[PDB]
Symmetry: D2
Subunit: 393 residues, 4 copies
């Protein structure tokens, strides 16, 4: 029986330090000494194991990578210095001028901009579609289609996508890679490779680190493709090299990932249910609600329903600013997945970079408020909302 | 009068900490709290100053950036998580499928690969020329030429390039950006903008940090272009986001940059002179040599001659391995610019990724050794080469 | 109503950062700049707030201190660079040659040594008694008695001490300080001041940091006494100055203290129950057991029963070694309170420094094993003991 | 021939990391795993090498310790979490109630308080004398004398003490240890064991780290005494355990110690000479001046004259505040030995804790200004003083 996820966030990929250090040391070194020239030339040629230089690989970073690969059930993992770097190192390794990419239209704002404006200036063709509609992916495929990409639940509407149905369509022609951004679930909730996904990416800045003090990304997938991503996407094209110090903080944060995800999902269900019945609140989105579109798909793909909640007030945008400015426990900031509860307004903040018309076509409204529930006491979270919401009348 | 470089590497871009901290604290935070929504919306719309999220900006990272922009005399500076990321974020922001790039053919191995393989699969045209030769730049210019790129002294031959000349040729046509990789010199030795260069990049992993423990890059230039590089190159395309903890370490390392560069240059002159008169050595490339090509150019562009030394042994490849395997003080590893002296063999190590014929055309032979001298005692360094070299011969 | 402990370990003592940093920066600075001399002179004379020098105070260290003082319900808290430093700075500030100290005889090995050997060469009188036994405290009180000191549950037998009782006896004479080492419980399980305790110390190296990567101590109590401990115990006598980088890591670790203590206590109840019914096990000490001595006292003093479990194998010393050498998931090392489960053998390890007869008098036998349960899957933990224990027997 | 000091601040005590890390990794771990119980019990008994727990020892900390021991030419070194901790762990390991200590009266203010008030309440007898006067030490010895302690140059007057003469006197009776606080020189300037000193201490917060961001101390001396200091002074009495992260920063700072000390001493000579001829300045103290008392002893004991300068204005204390408040490059703060130049006023700042009468009996006046010169450009340092001093007229 496979080591459980609970035990594995601490003990997968055990390290062997020469002194028996309980916590493996931090390899804050840019470079590694060769014993002789032959060894150096063998490593550079890929003929001998061992380290060379921190943009190419680092033992502290590998420690984190093997733990994550295990938790995602993939052969390998490549760590980067930001979720965007993980995304970009992946798609810029795979694609070239002439290729085609299909993406869900509801994405993190910066990923949407990368696909709409950067890839298209490098000669890559992109389609933005609703990949939650059965059959939509297959309808937009062309012979040169190389990647189908999506986020579920989506940032920030929490739209659910049936991953297995998307993979069926994408893999109905040879040579297509399906990439899922699994940031909002984390590996404790979902393992996208279960459903046919080829590559899984994360902003490790969010739940995996969980402590709001590290910006970093992760790429999980087959070893041969990830070796290409490492030697092309990381080494030359993005240069998104994580600091070994930051990787060591993420391994530290990872050790409480299982207890954090459970506590945050439990609190989120209580908070979502509270929000739903407040008279000032118009609509609440939470994957665990039975009336949430794709709830049955969500239950199939997610072990817990997450700590992300998106909601709309009956007083709209102006209502959203008043509530948000008057919260006393919940913190006003972007990002998510930390131990403290955060909240923000996607149309003027995380998704302001996406043109309104594209926002709204994807279901992102100007009234939406996006909340990431931490591990505070749930009654005190509810009480902060009550006081803030009662003031709206 | 302008704050000298010797004071500025400690005191340029002074910070204001609320507690008066002598060393400004480490902002190891991914996100920043808004006082109210209007302020957050305003910061995202570029209408109000203040911070948002570390991929977009961070106060510790800005501290290092302002210090480097001052030292390079540029309006702005963008830090990244690797010298390659600085190069990539810069050229991927500027160019688009269909553009043309001119580069010196003698570059760091990974940059040459970035240019030869990655840029060309994205529809960019690239020519590798000898920009040190009068006329080559102007002859290769095309209507879609956007960038002229070079390193001087070059990695690893230490070829000197007349920057003023290259800039006048590149800028004889409108809309061309000249980009210089100033890593081997550091801002203490050269400020390439003095010669007309538009953008200056660095692998801050080398001399600037100077302690062999951080991988990071810097981009220095005008505010307009660097604001585009930050919003496109960093934010979307590379995601080469420097760690605030590493930026703080670079700032620490930067405070001794002036005394390290001086001490390393002084050592390097002694070591280069010793290598040049050793019977096992065919050739020594050092910018300080009076005979060497580009010496008057190197002298006009460099305040010090640097601590890089490249040399070729008369016994070739096999001789290089024997010497590098028997060195006891000098450290065998890639990288450079640290306090400890480092040495390596470019054809099988840093430049093994470049096809042999491109290596050979750029003067990278297989008898070539590259050395980065640190701040050890110069006599102990020369004695390590003496025992290593004598054994080769005897 | 008071902020709950579950919220307070993240949000008590909120900081105000000038940039709105969500995670307050690391003040890794030794010294602080004065705006003018008067201000500096005023801060040194205790007449003006603000910082001076990190041995004397530091904003990152104050952040952790205010968070812990809130969690323990004390006016103040002083952080140190080790649990021993917290103990030493406290007792070396209070006592002077000629004073008398009463301590429970069952203590952490190094504290017992500090007390038995160091304090006594400095002219302090020390008696080690069983403070869990009615009357022993009052019977040993002398006119010069300054301190009554204990740990509950005790390291490593987990003996429970009725704190309210000990305090009423100690405070039946004027001028006595009761000091409780609350490391095994953490502020999430017990607030010893609720029972009349004056000073609470911790090895923050254990549960509070909770990630096995920091050595640090805390002292919690009244502002008057802690101001003396900071100006004498820390500043001159121990020089146990915590690193701001480590304090920041402790603050990070503290944010999950509530969910870790709950998860570890829940696991520990399951693991203790399994050990108790295993035929190779003679005895299991766990505060949650309904039969065990001091259970109603433990229940009144502890919100949770903790994750420490101590047990004795019927095959004694040789059996303990075999079991500890064949465990595959539980980690053999000293320390405790981390996310990973740790185990060790007190008579040859943490308490080997205490003369055998003192160990034996305090109930530390050589068949005794101490376990600190972490947050792994409870069934995997029990399966590691099952294979280890079955092999012992078979 | 012994590795030079220049080379040794980088290369003494070379480490062997399993991956060949050029910069040895950071052992930020509180504890170490035993391979078996027997190994654990052997280490605890002092019968087997290897690590146990970070208050007892740590590989990153040992790296720093062996580099320092080499540079000081002592058998061993114990690192602590502050210079005061180094001092206290040493004297509290050696002494017991009934013992006697002789100290120079001109000391860092906090050391003076430790000796005057803490040791005396633990039954230790202390004499404060001018140890620069030939014969003074011997005159105050008693049968129970265990330690003779001093600082040279002294903080903050820069009084010079003939170490060899002090050691002769102290070692004229059996069982006496001479302890020198060598913070103001650093091991690049002086190695006190050359002159008979038994134990050398440092505030590594100053020059050795040299970057004003770490508080830490160092104890250098024979292995058997330092083993006692480690197992009693550090383990139980002070608990002054340095953070491995801070030890790794100090090894990093140490690598530029030789170039820093030379540049700071060179700048200091220029600054002291400038100050000396300014008409607003009454008196300048600098060990390199030929009229400095004990100049000949200083030349004998110091390879360079240091970067510390103490001076007095003809406008006294009020003059000192005006100059100090108007310096623009020099930084107003306590501490010293960093890359930036610092300045402070000892009577109201570092030595305010010492009663006036004791200050003045030791030569510390209310007019003294203490300056620690960094590596800025010397003309710009002089120019900051010129503008500040000219304003005093
Ligand atoms: C992280 N998104 C953030 C921050 C941008 C404002 C959020 O929505 O608040 C993110 C990323 C990019 O990862 P980073 O480069 O910021 O580490 C990638 N995927 C997802 C889903 C998100 O949310
Ligand atoms: C360091 N002294 C300082 C700081 C106190 C104000 C200075 O004079 O400004 C010092 C110490 C103590 O070392 P730390 O505990 O501060 O690391 C010990 N010896 C000397 C000579 C001094 O100066
Ligand atoms: C590669 C082996 C290391 C190194 N040169 C690096 C370097 C770069 C890239 O900087 P990063 O390694 O990504 O921080 C860019 N510019 C120059 C000139 C470099 O030398 C080598 O040892 O040569
Ligand atoms: C010693 C082997 C470690 C540990 N107990 C530590 C501890 C201390 C000391 O704290 P520090 O190790 O200096 O941070 C003080 N109080 C208690 C109760 C402790 O347990 C052990 O494994 O028992």
């Amino acid at each position: 029986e496979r080591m459980t996820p609970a035990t594995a966030c601490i003990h997968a990929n055990p390290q062997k330090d020469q002194f028996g250090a309980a916590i493996p040391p931090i390899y804050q070194t840019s470079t590694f000494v060769f014993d002789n020239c032959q060894q150096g030339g063998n490593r550079f040629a890929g003929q001998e194991s061992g380290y060379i230089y921190t943009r190419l690989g680092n033992p502290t970073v590998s420690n984190l990578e093997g733990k994550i690969a295990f938790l995602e059930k993939t052969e390998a993992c490549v760590a980067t210095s930001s979720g965007m770097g993980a995304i970009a190192a992946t798609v810029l390794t795979i694609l070239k001028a002439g290729d085609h990419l299909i993406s869900d239209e509801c994405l993190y704002g910066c990923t949407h901009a990368l696909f709409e404006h950067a890839l298209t200036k490098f000669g890559i063709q992109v389609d933005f579609i609703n990949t939650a509609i059965p059959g939509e992916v297959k309808k937009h495929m062309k012979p040169n289609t190389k990647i189908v990409y999506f986020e579920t639940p989506a940032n920030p509407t929490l739209k659910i996508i049936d991953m297995e149905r998307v993979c069926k369509d994408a893999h109905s022609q040879e040579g297509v890679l399906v990439i899922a951004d699994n940031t909002f679930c984390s590996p404790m909730i979902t393992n996208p490779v279960d459903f046919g996904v080829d590559v899984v990416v994360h902003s490790a800045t969010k739940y995996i680190n969980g402590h709001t003090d590290v910006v970093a990304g992760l790429i999980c997938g087959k070893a041969d493709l990830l070796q290409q991503i490492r030697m092309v996407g990381i080494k030359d094209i993005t240069g998104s090299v994580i600091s070994p110090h930051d990787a060591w903080l993420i391994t530290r944060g990872l050790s409480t990932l299982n207890i954090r995800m459970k506590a945050e999902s439990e609190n989120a269900m209580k908070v979502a249910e509270y929000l739903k019945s407040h008279p000032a609140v118009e609509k609440v989105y939470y994957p665990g609600f039975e009336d949430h579109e794709g709830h049955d798909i969500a239950k199939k793909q997610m072990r817990m329903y997450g700590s992300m909640i998106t909601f709309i007030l009956k007083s709209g945008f102006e209502g959203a600013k008043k509530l948000l400015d008057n919260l006393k426990l919940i913190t006003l900031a972007v990002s998510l997945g930390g131990c403290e509860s955060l909240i923000q307004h996607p149309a003027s903040m995380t998704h302001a970079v996406v043109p309104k018309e594209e926002r709204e076509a994807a279901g992102i409204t100007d009234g939406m408020i996006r909340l990431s529930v931490g591990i505070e006491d749930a009654d005190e979270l509810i009480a902060d909302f009550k006081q803030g919401l009662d003031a709206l009348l």
